[PDB]
Amino acid sequence: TNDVHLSGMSRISQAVLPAGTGTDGYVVVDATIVPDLLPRLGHAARIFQRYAVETLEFEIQPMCPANTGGGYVAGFLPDPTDNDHTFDALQATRGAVVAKWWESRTVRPQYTRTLLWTSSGKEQRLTSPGRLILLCVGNNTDVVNVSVLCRWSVRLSVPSLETP
Amino acid sequence: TDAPVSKASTVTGFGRGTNDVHLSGMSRISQAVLPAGTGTDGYVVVDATIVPDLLPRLGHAARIFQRYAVETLEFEIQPMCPANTGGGYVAGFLPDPTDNDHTFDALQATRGAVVAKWWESRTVRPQYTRTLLWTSSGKEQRLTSPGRLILLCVGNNTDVVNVSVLCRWSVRLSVPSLETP
Amino acid sequence: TNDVHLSGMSRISQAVLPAGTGTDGYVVVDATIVPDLLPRLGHAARIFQRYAVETLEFEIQPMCPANTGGGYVAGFLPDPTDNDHTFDALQATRGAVVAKWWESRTVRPQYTRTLLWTSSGKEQRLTSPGRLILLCVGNNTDVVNVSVLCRWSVRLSVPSLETP
Amino acid sequence: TNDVHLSGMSRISQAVLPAGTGTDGYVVVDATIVPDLLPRLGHAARIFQRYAVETLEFEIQPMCPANTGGGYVAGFLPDPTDNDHTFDALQATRGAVVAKWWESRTVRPQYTRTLLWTSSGKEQRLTSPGRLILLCVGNNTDVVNVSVLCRWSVRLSVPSLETP
Amino acid sequence: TNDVHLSGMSRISQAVLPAGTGTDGYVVVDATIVPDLLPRLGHAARIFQRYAVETLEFEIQPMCPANTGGGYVAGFLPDPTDNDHTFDALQATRGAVVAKWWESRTVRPQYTRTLLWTSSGKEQRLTSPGRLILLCVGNNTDVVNVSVLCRWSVRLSVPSLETP
Amino acid sequence: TDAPVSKASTVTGFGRGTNDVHLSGMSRISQAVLPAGTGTDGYVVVDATIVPDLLPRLGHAARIFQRYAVETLEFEIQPMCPANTGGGYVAGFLPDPTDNDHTFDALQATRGAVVAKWWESRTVRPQYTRTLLWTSSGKEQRLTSPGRLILLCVGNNTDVVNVSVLCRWSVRLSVPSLETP
Ligand SMILES: [Ca+2]
Ligand SMILES: [Ca+2]
Ligand SMILES: [Ca+2]
Ligand SMILES: [Ca+2]
Ligand SMILES: [Ca+2]
Ligand SMILES: [Ca+2]
C-alpha cells in the first residue's frame, strides 16, 4: 500500500459578519468539505486521486469583543447532498455545538471513513465526507470575525496530476 | 643544564579555551503597536528571523563562539490589550529562514502554529533543527538561523493592540573563537 | 510521522534537434533537477520544506528513425554548481550512457543522499541533487525528438505551504 | 590501508569510419589500455604507483543507421606487445564479439590479474593489461561513428605523485 | 559505500620571510584549506565530488638558524568565511601554537567532519574545513624559510572529473 | 470560565535567567617592544589593570552580568628574545588597583613577584581577592579590579626585546543583567 498519510490544521472558512446583519438562522459559514477547500490538502489532492479521512475535527475560533451579544451554532452534516440549513438540522447531527460569539468551540463530527475521490463528479457522496454549517443564534451587537479551522488527517492514494 | 643557542618556548596552555557553554534565557524578539483599523487580514505584525544577534546575551556569547545548536526554542505571543478588542492573530515559526511567505495558510501549515483572539496569549512550540548552526553570518542563511517567527492579523482590530513577542531559548555554543562583525 | 514517501516518473526535458545541427559536443539537454521540474513532486515540495532523494533514475527516449546517424551521451552530474559540459566530465559520472540516436537508454546515477530543501535559496547545492546533461556525439542525419524522463523517489519532511 | 578500490566507465576510443573505407580487415580501433587513456583512472594512477585490474569490460557502441551493411569484430588482446591485427587473432581471445555495424555489443575479456605499474617504462607488459582491437568485417555502406567504452575496476597501491 | 579513504602528508605552504620584514602581526601564511591546495589530494579531488576530513594536522617546519630572533603563532580557524587575521583570533581557537622561528610545531585543530564539496561554490562553509594562519610574533633577525606541511586523511565520494 | 473584564497576565518565566556562569580562558594582557638601550633600570615595560574589559571574552561575558569573582589568576612573562640579550625584568601583581608605585622594591614586596633575565620566562602566581567584584566601572576601582600587573626592566637591554605578558584567568559571574558602557 503506497498510501501517503498527511495531516495538519488549516482554516476552512473566514467570515466577517457585520453588526446587525446576523439575524437568527443566518448562514455565516456553509462549506462542503472537499480537499480543495483545505490549503495544504489542496495540493495533496492535486497530486493524488483518492483520499480517506482518518481524523476530522473543526474549530470555530470567532474573534470579537467579550461584550458582544448573540451566539452561533455549528454542525457537520455527514451528507454532502443535503441542502437543509436550519437549526433543526444542526441539532439533529452529532458533534454540533452552540456557544456565544466570543467562545471558541470544537465540533467532533461523524464522518465516513471510506475512500472518497479528490476530483468532483456527478455524485457528491463519493467525493466529500459532508459539509459544515455555522449559523447565527440571535442577533449580534458587534462586528464578528469568525475563522473556522480544521484539524484533519487523510490517507492519499492513486497518484495523478489533477486540475482546479 | 648547559647554555644553548636558544631555549625552547615554554608556552603550554595556549589554544586550550573552553569549548562548550550552555546558555539559556528569555527575551523580547518583537514589540508591535497597531492603531484601530490598520490590522486588516494578512497584515504582518511581526517578522523576526531567529538569529543569535536577535537575542542580546546570545549575541554577545556568539561573538566568542563559532557554532551553536538550539536545544530548546519556544515563543510567547502576549498581547496586552483588553477583552473588548475585536480581531485575532495567527503566529507560526517557519523552519526555513529563507522563505518569505506571509499568509495565514503558510503559517497554519507549520507545526505548533497558533490562532487566537487579540485578548488571548499563546505559546508557539515550533519545529526547529537541532543541527549545529553558524554564529556568524554568511552567504546562505539556512546554515545560520533555525527559522523565522511570523505573526499576522486574522481580522480587523477594533481598538489599539499592543503585542509583545517573547522567546525562551536554550543554546549550546561550541568551537571557541573571537568573531568580529 | 512527518516523513512521507513519494515516487513517480515524469519528463524532465523535451528537446528537438534538427538535422545537421547536432554537432559533436552540442548540448541537447541541461536540466537542473529541482522539485518544480517534476509536476507531482512539484506539488509535493510545495507542501513540504525538506526532501531527500532516495532513488533516482533517468530514461533517455530519443524518437527518431532507425536511419539516423550519430548518437548522444547522457549523464547526471551530482553537482548542481558544476558547469562542465564535455564528454569526459559526463563519462566520469556513475551511470553515464552513450547510445545511438535511435536507441533508448537508462542512467543509474550515483549521488549523496542528503536532506535537501524544497524551496530555492542562495546555495544551489542545498536544494538540488544535481543536473542532467545530454550532449551530441557525432552528427545526426535526421531530426530527433528527445524526451528525457526521470524516475524518482523522495522522502518529504517538515510540513509547510510554500509559494513559487 | 594503501589499497583503494576504484571503478568507472569511460570512452577509450572515438573513431569515424566514412562510407566505403571500411574494407574487411581494416583497423578501426587499436587502443593500448593504459591509465592515461581513462580520465578518472588517469588521475587515480597519477596519485599512485601500482594498480591491478580487477574487472574489465568493453562496450562497442557504433552509431549508424540500421540500413548500414557490414560489421565489426572487437577483441581484447591481453598482450600489449602483440601486434597481430587479423580476424583469427581477435576471435581466439576470450570475449571477442562479431556484430553488425548497427548493433552495440559487450566484450568480457580474460586476462591475468597482476599488479601493474601506473607509470610507463621500457617493458609495456608491466604497465598495461593489453590492447583493444576493433576491425571491420565486410564493407560498410554508410558512415559509422564508433565509440569504444571501457567499464573498469582497479585496485591502487604504493601512493606517490607522478607526472605525465 | 564506495568511499575511498586516502591519506598522506604534503606541504600546504612555502613562505620566504626576509630579514626585517617580519613585523608583529605580519601574515606569513594564509591558506584556506581546500583539496586543491594539497598536491595529492588535488588529483584525488579532481576525480571526486565530495570529501570528508577524518584526520587533519598541520606541521610548521621553519628552516632558519637557531640564533634568529622573533617567533611565530599558527592557528586553524574552523570558519573558512572568517577574515580576522590577528593574534587574538589565533589565540582564541584551539590547537594554536606559538614558538620561536627555529622550532617545529604541530597544530592539532578543531575541524568539521561533515561531507564537504571538492569544487568551489557560493558558500565556503560547504567546501572547506577552515583556514590556516601563520603570523609573526616580534621581528625576525635572519631570513626565515617556513614550510607548512599537513598530515591529512580524507574520505572521497561521488566520482566525477572536475576542472581547475 | 466566565468572561471577565480583564484576564490575568500569563507571563511566568520572566526574570528567571541563568545566574552563575564559570568562564575560563587565557589572553595576552600586554605586548611590548624595547629597542636597544631604552630599557634602563626602572623603565615600566608593562602596566595593566586587570579588569574584565582587558580580557575580551571576559569583557563580553561581563557585559551581561553584574558581579564577578576571580577563582584563578596567573600570569606568564614570555620574552621571545635570544639568550645573548643582556638585562632582566621584574614582574609583580599589585593587589591594589589604585596604587601607582612603579619601582623594583614595590614589585618585589608583593608575593609571587619574579625577577628574571630577558631570555627566561616566568610565571607570576599572585595574591588576589576572592571577593565579589563589580563588572561595571564606578567611582572606586578597588571594588571592580583585583589589582594591576606591572613589569619593569632591571638592567639595560643589549638587544631589542619582545615581551608578551599573558594571563590565565578563571572567573565566576553572578547577578545577571544587561550592562551598557
Ligand atoms: Ca480525478
Ligand atoms: Ca565565525
Ligand atoms: Ca522552503
Ligand atoms: Ca611510477
Ligand atoms: Ca563539483
Ligand atoms: Ca553593572
mmCIF file of C-alpha atoms in Angstrom, chain A residues 20-164:
data_model
loop_
_atom_site.group_PDB
_atom_site.id
_atom_site.type_symbol
_atom_site.label_atom_id
_atom_site.label_comp_id
_atom_site.label_asym_id
_atom_site.label_seq_id
_atom_site.Cartn_x
_atom_site.Cartn_y
_atom_site.Cartn_z
ATOM 1 C CA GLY A 20 -26.924 43.974 12.873
ATOM 2 C CA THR A 21 -26.913 41.607 9.885
ATOM 3 C CA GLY A 22 -26.612 38.441 11.970
ATOM 4 C CA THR A 23 -30.289 37.566 12.235
ATOM 5 C CA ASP A 24 -31.289 34.199 13.665
ATOM 6 C CA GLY A 25 -30.678 31.361 11.228
ATOM 7 C CA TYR A 26 -28.356 33.397 9.003
ATOM 8 C CA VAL A 27 -25.841 31.092 7.313
ATOM 9 C CA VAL A 28 -22.479 32.513 8.367
ATOM 10 C CA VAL A 29 -20.465 29.563 7.038
ATOM 11 C CA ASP A 30 -21.508 26.905 4.511
ATOM 12 C CA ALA A 31 -18.613 24.747 3.330
ATOM 13 C CA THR A 32 -18.778 21.375 1.600
ATOM 14 C CA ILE A 33 -15.641 19.736 2.968
ATOM 15 C CA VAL A 34 -13.503 18.859 -0.056
ATOM 16 C CA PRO A 35 -9.693 18.712 -0.149
ATOM 17 C CA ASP A 36 -9.619 21.742 -2.457
ATOM 18 C CA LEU A 37 -11.087 23.779 0.410
ATOM 19 C CA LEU A 38 -8.099 22.982 2.623
ATOM 20 C CA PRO A 39 -4.859 24.820 1.696
ATOM 21 C CA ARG A 40 -2.251 22.062 2.118
ATOM 22 C CA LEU A 41 -4.687 19.251 1.385
ATOM 23 C CA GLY A 42 -5.436 21.265 -1.747
ATOM 24 C CA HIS A 43 -2.013 20.491 -3.202
ATOM 25 C CA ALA A 44 -2.043 16.996 -1.707
ATOM 26 C CA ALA A 45 -5.266 16.219 -3.584
ATOM 27 C CA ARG A 46 -3.902 17.938 -6.641
ATOM 28 C CA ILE A 47 -1.199 15.270 -6.787
ATOM 29 C CA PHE A 48 -3.454 12.335 -5.792
ATOM 30 C CA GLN A 49 -6.692 10.743 -6.961
ATOM 31 C CA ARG A 50 -8.273 9.260 -3.831
ATOM 32 C CA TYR A 51 -8.295 10.153 -0.149
ATOM 33 C CA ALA A 52 -9.716 8.702 3.055
ATOM 34 C CA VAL A 53 -10.482 10.903 6.060
ATOM 35 C CA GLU A 54 -8.941 9.330 9.163
ATOM 36 C CA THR A 55 -9.303 12.284 11.551
ATOM 37 C CA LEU A 56 -11.629 15.261 11.159
ATOM 38 C CA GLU A 57 -12.296 17.998 13.713
ATOM 39 C CA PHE A 58 -13.453 21.584 13.242
ATOM 40 C CA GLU A 59 -12.503 24.521 15.460
ATOM 41 C CA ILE A 60 -14.744 27.581 15.483
ATOM 42 C CA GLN A 61 -12.468 30.458 16.541
ATOM 43 C CA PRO A 62 -14.507 33.684 16.356
ATOM 44 C CA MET A 63 -12.646 36.893 17.207
ATOM 45 C CA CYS A 64 -14.931 39.510 18.748
ATOM 46 C CA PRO A 65 -15.230 41.507 21.982
ATOM 47 C CA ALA A 66 -16.418 39.586 25.028
ATOM 48 C CA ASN A 67 -19.308 42.044 25.478
ATOM 49 C CA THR A 68 -20.899 41.120 22.139
ATOM 50 C CA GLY A 69 -24.369 39.604 22.081
ATOM 51 C CA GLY A 70 -25.832 36.599 20.290
ATOM 52 C CA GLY A 71 -24.215 33.297 19.526
ATOM 53 C CA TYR A 72 -23.568 30.635 16.924
ATOM 54 C CA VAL A 73 -24.458 27.011 16.264
ATOM 55 C CA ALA A 74 -22.025 24.882 14.265
ATOM 56 C CA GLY A 75 -22.547 21.391 12.918
ATOM 57 C CA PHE A 76 -21.239 18.948 10.344
ATOM 58 C CA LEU A 77 -23.849 17.295 8.143
ATOM 59 C CA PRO A 78 -22.396 13.927 7.045
ATOM 60 C CA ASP A 79 -24.335 14.134 3.771
ATOM 61 C CA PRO A 80 -22.813 16.472 1.162
ATOM 62 C CA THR A 81 -26.031 16.302 -0.868
ATOM 63 C CA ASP A 82 -28.238 17.563 1.976
ATOM 64 C CA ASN A 83 -29.311 21.185 1.492
ATOM 65 C CA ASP A 84 -31.149 21.750 4.786
ATOM 66 C CA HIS A 85 -29.592 24.783 6.508
ATOM 67 C CA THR A 86 -31.507 25.310 9.759
ATOM 68 C CA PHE A 87 -31.017 24.990 13.499
ATOM 69 C CA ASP A 88 -33.014 21.745 13.482
ATOM 70 C CA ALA A 89 -30.697 20.019 11.005
ATOM 71 C CA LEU A 90 -27.637 21.047 13.017
ATOM 72 C CA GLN A 91 -29.139 19.996 16.353
ATOM 73 C CA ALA A 92 -30.088 16.595 14.941
ATOM 74 C CA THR A 93 -26.491 15.783 13.978
ATOM 75 C CA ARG A 94 -23.790 14.695 16.383
ATOM 76 C CA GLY A 95 -20.823 16.791 17.347
ATOM 77 C CA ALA A 96 -22.713 20.056 16.885
ATOM 78 C CA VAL A 97 -22.033 22.898 19.316
ATOM 79 C CA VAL A 98 -23.812 26.108 20.307
ATOM 80 C CA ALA A 99 -21.915 28.892 22.042
ATOM 81 C CA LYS A 100 -21.599 32.644 22.433
ATOM 82 C CA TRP A 101 -19.755 34.649 19.801
ATOM 83 C CA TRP A 102 -16.692 35.158 21.994
ATOM 84 C CA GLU A 103 -16.300 31.432 22.734
ATOM 85 C CA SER A 104 -14.108 29.009 20.797
ATOM 86 C CA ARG A 105 -15.577 25.560 20.207
ATOM 87 C CA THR A 106 -14.673 22.200 18.693
ATOM 88 C CA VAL A 107 -17.014 20.143 16.510
ATOM 89 C CA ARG A 108 -16.051 16.465 16.549
ATOM 90 C CA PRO A 109 -18.263 15.149 13.737
ATOM 91 C CA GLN A 110 -19.483 11.813 12.418
ATOM 92 C CA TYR A 111 -17.825 11.332 9.031
ATOM 93 C CA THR A 112 -17.407 8.456 6.611
ATOM 94 C CA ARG A 113 -14.028 6.720 6.572
ATOM 95 C CA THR A 114 -14.434 5.240 3.083
ATOM 96 C CA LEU A 115 -12.158 6.060 0.159
ATOM 97 C CA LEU A 116 -13.526 9.217 -1.480
ATOM 98 C CA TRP A 117 -12.442 10.921 -4.699
ATOM 99 C CA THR A 118 -10.357 14.097 -4.755
ATOM 100 C CA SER A 119 -11.891 15.347 -8.012
ATOM 101 C CA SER A 120 -15.517 16.358 -8.460
ATOM 102 C CA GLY A 121 -18.107 14.090 -10.004
ATOM 103 C CA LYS A 122 -21.797 13.538 -10.603
ATOM 104 C CA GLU A 123 -22.335 12.105 -7.110
ATOM 105 C CA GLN A 124 -21.088 14.241 -4.226
ATOM 106 C CA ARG A 125 -21.307 11.306 -1.809
ATOM 107 C CA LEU A 126 -18.184 9.787 -3.402
ATOM 108 C CA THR A 127 -16.134 12.995 -3.129
ATOM 109 C CA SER A 128 -16.853 14.685 0.212
ATOM 110 C CA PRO A 129 -17.379 13.448 3.781
ATOM 111 C CA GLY A 130 -20.036 16.112 4.318
ATOM 112 C CA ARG A 131 -20.494 19.828 4.834
ATOM 113 C CA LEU A 132 -20.021 22.228 7.737
ATOM 114 C CA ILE A 133 -22.638 24.844 8.623
ATOM 115 C CA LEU A 134 -22.230 27.737 11.056
ATOM 116 C CA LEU A 135 -25.419 29.703 11.774
ATOM 117 C CA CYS A 136 -26.346 32.671 13.945
ATOM 118 C CA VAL A 137 -28.363 32.181 17.130
ATOM 119 C CA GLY A 138 -29.961 35.527 17.883
ATOM 120 C CA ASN A 139 -28.738 38.938 16.784
ATOM 121 C CA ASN A 140 -25.138 40.084 17.090
ATOM 122 C CA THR A 141 -24.265 43.500 18.509
ATOM 123 C CA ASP A 142 -20.651 43.990 17.377
ATOM 124 C CA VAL A 143 -18.818 43.147 14.165
ATOM 125 C CA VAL A 144 -17.890 39.457 14.360
ATOM 126 C CA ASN A 145 -14.900 37.945 12.560
ATOM 127 C CA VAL A 146 -15.183 34.155 12.680
ATOM 128 C CA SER A 147 -12.490 31.788 11.425
ATOM 129 C CA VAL A 148 -13.334 28.100 11.114
ATOM 130 C CA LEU A 149 -10.225 25.910 11.292
ATOM 131 C CA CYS A 150 -9.972 22.149 10.820
ATOM 132 C CA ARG A 151 -7.593 19.567 12.235
ATOM 133 C CA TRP A 152 -7.584 16.915 9.527
ATOM 134 C CA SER A 153 -5.697 13.717 8.807
ATOM 135 C CA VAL A 154 -6.066 11.931 5.477
ATOM 136 C CA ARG A 155 -4.637 8.990 3.638
ATOM 137 C CA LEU A 156 -3.944 9.621 -0.048
ATOM 138 C CA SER A 157 -3.735 7.119 -2.891
ATOM 139 C CA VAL A 158 -3.602 6.642 -6.670
ATOM 140 C CA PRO A 159 -1.052 9.242 -7.854
ATOM 141 C CA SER A 160 -2.061 11.681 -10.592
ATOM 142 C CA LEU A 161 -1.884 15.363 -11.583
ATOM 143 C CA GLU A 162 -5.310 16.952 -11.306
ATOM 144 C CA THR A 163 -6.553 20.385 -12.363
ATOM 145 C CA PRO A 164 -8.642 23.010 -10.485
#
